[PDB]
């Protein structure tokens, strides 16, 4: 509760400062072995108001947006996004037509330059070494990682532990 109160006090200088502060703390927590702490801090940050574009849930697409995040924050968001995807397929509540990762958003999408972007390669390698060769790239967009519903049907995925 002391941590939540200090977070509430800090959430008064602006979302511009808040996003950078959360990026810094998430990178630190991820690269210091505190994956569970990073996940819980991201969870308490989401309901605060920071990273409003992080998650989208609907019959069409389940998306995770990381273009504004750091490498550490992207890994933490991907870790909890993959876990939530595994929560479905345990119930008969249908499945979205598509699951995407917004690695790069902007003009770079319609170009091959975004293919070599650090965010894109980092997200692709994380997905490849966690859920095998299931999340492939998009043949129309140069900054998205996609996975069709058929490949979702065949799909706790990431182990979150404190060092």
């Amino acid at each position: 509760q002391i941590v939540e109160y200090v977070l509430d006090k800090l959430n008064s200088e602006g979302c511009g400062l808040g996003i950078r502060f959360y990026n810094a703390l998430l990178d630190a927590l991820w690269w210091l072995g505190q994956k569970e702490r990073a996940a819980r801090v991201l969870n308490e940050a989401t309901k605060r108001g920071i990273f409003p574009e992080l998650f989208r849930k609907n019959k069409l697409v389940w998306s995770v947006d990381v273009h504004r995040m750091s490498e550490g924050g992207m890994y933490t968001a991907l870790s909890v996004w993959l876990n939530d995807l595994s929560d479905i397929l345990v119930k008969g509540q249908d499945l979205p037509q598509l699951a995407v990762v917004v690695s790069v958003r902007g003009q770079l999408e319609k170009s091959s330059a975004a293919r070599e972007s650090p965010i894109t390669r980092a997200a692709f390698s994380f997905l490849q070494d966690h859920v095998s060769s299931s999340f492939s790239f998009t043949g129309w967009n140069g900054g998205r990682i996609m996975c069709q519903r058929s490949q979702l049907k065949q799909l706790n995925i990431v182990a979150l532990t404190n060092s």
Binding site: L60, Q97, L98, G139, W140, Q148
Partner: peptide, 14 residues
């Protein structure tokens, strides 16, 4: 324009 992109556009447009 693959069949995958066409099907996705069909669903989203519908």
């Amino acid at each position: 324009v693959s069949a995958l992109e066409r099907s996705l556009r069909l669903t989203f447009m519908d």
